[PDB]
Subunit: 73 residues, 2 copies
Protein backbone atom coordinates (compact mmCIF):
# COMPACT_ATOMS: atom_id res chain seq x y z
CA UNK A 1 0.00 0.00 0.00
CA UNK A 2 2.06 2.94 1.32
CA UNK A 3 5.21 3.93 -0.59
CA UNK A 4 7.31 3.07 2.48
CA UNK A 5 6.64 -0.70 2.14
CA UNK A 6 6.80 -0.74 -1.66
CA UNK A 7 10.25 -1.57 -3.06
CA UNK A 8 11.58 -0.67 -6.51
CA UNK A 9 14.17 -2.69 -8.40
CA UNK A 10 17.17 -0.46 -9.02
CA UNK A 11 18.97 -2.20 -11.90
CA UNK A 12 19.59 0.21 -14.73
CA UNK A 13 17.02 -1.10 -17.26
CA UNK A 14 14.35 -2.39 -14.86
CA UNK A 15 11.80 -0.62 -12.68
CA UNK A 16 9.60 -3.32 -11.25
CA UNK A 17 7.98 -2.32 -7.95
CA UNK A 18 7.19 -5.04 -5.41
CA UNK A 19 3.73 -4.26 -4.00
CA UNK A 20 2.96 -6.32 -0.86
CA UNK A 21 -0.80 -6.01 -1.39
CA UNK A 22 -0.42 -7.54 -4.84
CA UNK A 23 2.25 -10.12 -4.16
CA UNK A 24 4.12 -11.38 -7.21
CA UNK A 25 2.54 -13.86 -9.62
CA UNK A 26 5.71 -14.81 -11.51
CA UNK A 27 7.50 -15.56 -8.24
CA UNK A 28 4.54 -17.50 -6.77
CA UNK A 29 4.31 -14.97 -3.91
CA UNK A 30 0.72 -14.56 -2.58
CA UNK A 31 -0.83 -11.13 -1.97
CA UNK A 32 -0.17 -9.71 1.50
CA UNK A 33 3.47 -10.91 1.63
CA UNK A 34 5.75 -8.20 3.03
CA UNK A 35 9.08 -7.55 1.31
CA UNK A 36 10.94 -8.70 4.44
CA UNK A 37 9.10 -12.03 4.38
CA UNK A 38 9.98 -12.89 0.76
CA UNK A 39 11.98 -16.12 0.30
CA UNK A 40 15.76 -15.95 0.23
CA UNK A 41 15.77 -17.29 -3.34
CA UNK A 42 13.29 -14.62 -4.57
CA UNK A 43 14.36 -12.59 -7.59
CA UNK A 44 12.89 -9.63 -9.45
CA UNK A 45 10.33 -11.14 -11.87
CA UNK A 46 11.47 -8.72 -14.59
CA UNK A 47 15.28 -8.60 -14.48
CA UNK A 48 15.95 -11.47 -11.98
CA UNK A 49 18.07 -9.30 -9.65
CA UNK A 50 18.25 -10.43 -6.02
CA UNK A 51 16.50 -8.40 -3.38
CA UNK A 52 19.76 -6.53 -2.64
CA UNK A 53 18.93 -4.51 -5.78
CA UNK A 54 15.70 -3.09 -4.29
CA UNK A 55 14.99 0.17 -2.44
CA UNK A 56 11.87 1.33 -0.55
CA UNK A 57 9.94 3.98 -2.44
CA UNK A 58 10.09 6.68 0.25
CA UNK A 59 11.61 7.16 3.68
CA UNK A 60 15.22 6.62 4.70
CA UNK A 61 16.11 3.59 2.56
CA UNK A 62 14.69 5.37 -0.50
CA UNK A 63 17.67 7.76 -0.56
CA UNK A 64 20.32 5.08 0.04
CA UNK A 65 22.35 3.28 -2.60
CA UNK A 66 21.44 -0.43 -2.54
CA UNK A 67 24.10 -3.16 -2.25
CA UNK A 68 23.22 -4.46 -5.71
CA UNK A 69 25.19 -6.97 -7.81
CA UNK A 70 23.83 -5.94 -11.28
CA UNK A 71 24.50 -2.49 -12.80
CA UNK A 72 22.38 0.37 -11.41
CA UNK A 73 22.67 4.13 -10.85
CA UNK B 1 4.90 9.17 -4.92
CA UNK B 2 1.49 8.18 -3.70
CA UNK B 3 0.27 4.95 -5.37
CA UNK B 4 -2.63 6.65 -7.20
CA UNK B 5 0.06 8.61 -9.10
CA UNK B 6 2.19 5.56 -10.00
CA UNK B 7 1.40 3.63 -13.17
CA UNK B 8 2.18 0.00 -13.90
CA UNK B 9 2.76 -1.45 -17.36
CA UNK B 10 0.38 -4.42 -17.68
CA UNK B 11 1.93 -5.85 -20.84
CA UNK B 12 2.49 -9.60 -20.47
CA UNK B 13 5.78 -10.21 -18.59
CA UNK B 14 6.49 -6.50 -18.05
CA UNK B 15 5.36 -4.55 -14.97
CA UNK B 16 7.57 -1.47 -15.18
CA UNK B 17 6.21 1.33 -12.99
CA UNK B 18 6.26 4.97 -14.00
CA UNK B 19 6.96 6.85 -10.77
CA UNK B 20 6.36 10.57 -11.42
CA UNK B 21 8.99 11.50 -8.79
CA UNK B 22 11.64 9.56 -10.75
CA UNK B 23 10.75 10.69 -14.21
CA UNK B 24 12.10 8.39 -16.93
CA UNK B 25 15.77 8.64 -17.96
CA UNK B 26 15.43 6.40 -21.04
CA UNK B 27 12.36 8.38 -22.13
CA UNK B 28 14.18 11.65 -21.31
CA UNK B 29 11.28 12.57 -19.02
CA UNK B 30 12.38 14.90 -16.19
CA UNK B 31 11.44 14.14 -12.56
CA UNK B 32 8.16 15.60 -11.40
CA UNK B 33 6.32 14.82 -14.66
CA UNK B 34 2.91 13.33 -13.89
CA UNK B 35 1.90 10.33 -15.97
CA UNK B 36 -1.01 12.37 -17.37
CA UNK B 37 1.51 14.94 -18.71
CA UNK B 38 3.83 12.40 -20.37
CA UNK B 39 4.47 13.03 -24.10
CA UNK B 40 1.96 11.65 -26.61
CA UNK B 41 4.51 9.22 -28.11
CA UNK B 42 5.90 8.16 -24.69
CA UNK B 43 6.28 4.40 -24.33
CA UNK B 44 7.29 1.89 -21.69
CA UNK B 45 11.12 1.91 -21.63
CA UNK B 46 11.15 -1.87 -21.24
CA UNK B 47 8.51 -3.22 -23.61
CA UNK B 48 7.53 -0.20 -25.85
CA UNK B 49 3.89 -0.32 -24.67
CA UNK B 50 1.94 2.91 -25.11
CA UNK B 51 0.38 4.59 -22.10
CA UNK B 52 -2.87 2.81 -22.80
CA UNK B 53 -1.29 -0.43 -21.44
CA UNK B 54 -0.69 1.09 -17.94
CA UNK B 55 -2.91 1.39 -14.89
CA UNK B 56 -2.55 3.23 -11.58
CA UNK B 57 -1.41 1.33 -8.51
CA UNK B 58 -4.58 2.59 -6.73
CA UNK B 59 -7.78 4.46 -7.53
CA UNK B 60 -10.17 4.24 -10.48
CA UNK B 61 -8.69 2.03 -13.17
CA UNK B 62 -6.36 0.20 -10.76
CA UNK B 63 -8.49 -2.98 -10.78
CA UNK B 64 -9.31 -3.50 -14.49
CA UNK B 65 -7.18 -5.10 -17.21
CA UNK B 66 -5.93 -2.29 -19.50
CA UNK B 67 -6.92 -2.52 -23.15
CA UNK B 68 -4.26 -1.47 -25.65
CA UNK B 69 -2.14 -2.53 -28.62
CA UNK B 70 -0.17 -5.12 -26.61
CA UNK B 71 -1.34 -8.33 -24.90
CA UNK B 72 -1.98 -7.42 -21.26
CA UNK B 73 -2.44 -9.29 -17.95
CA UNK B 74 -4.63 -8.87 -14.85
FE1 LIG C 1 14.42 -5.83 -11.74
FE1 LIG D 1 6.18 -2.46 -20.28
Amino acid sequence: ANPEDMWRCQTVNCGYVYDPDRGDKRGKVPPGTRFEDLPDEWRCPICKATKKCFRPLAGPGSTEQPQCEMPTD
